[PDB]
């Protein structure tokens, strides 16, 4: 199966862009402790810690199915 | 088809991420405003705009042929 | 092959998110410049550098085996 293989690797590079997704949110995050502080951004993260769970929910799902 | 749907499940991911990303690059506009204005980034929110229409395009032309 | 070439529009999707992903790092970089330099922020660049060229690699590994 060239296909699974293959569908393998793209939730590999699904799962190592949502590493660089959460590096670049730090990013931000630091750059917003300075300039401003953290407080207004709750319902931010909220946000994004929310389609984090979604996107980790997605890889679980795929390595569950993939899974016999 | 284990594959059909676990290529709906790559695609959700992507869907999610997309969504990530663009709660992301909001972050990042909202900084720009305090921090300088957003006259000087014209040029990259058409970068960034232009790859979104890209990815909402592949995301329907994956649902498009998803479809019968 | 409809699973074929939506494994292609998938992996074209994952490749058009990488150039969002990137351009949207090098606004943060640009941030960082302005708001501080970016001499402590050499780790960080590695990170991002390496989960890029972790993307990359599958990029190149799923169109290398889509190839014959």
């Given at each position: 199966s060239g296909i699974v293989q293959q569908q393998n690797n793209l939730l590999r590079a699904i799962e190592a862009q949502q590493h660089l997704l959460q590096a670049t949110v730090w990013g931000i995050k630091q750059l917003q402790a300075?300039?401003?502080?953290?407080?207004?951004?709750?319902?931010?993260?909220?946000?994004?810690?929310?389609?984090?769970?979604?996107?980790?929910?997605?890889?679980?799902?795929?390595?569950?199915?993939?899974?016999?």
């Open positions: 300075r300039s401003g502080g953290r407080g207004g951004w709750m319902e931010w993260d909220r946000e994004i810690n929310n389609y984090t769970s979604l996107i980790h929910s997605l890889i679980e799902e795929s390595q569950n199915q993939q899974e016999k």
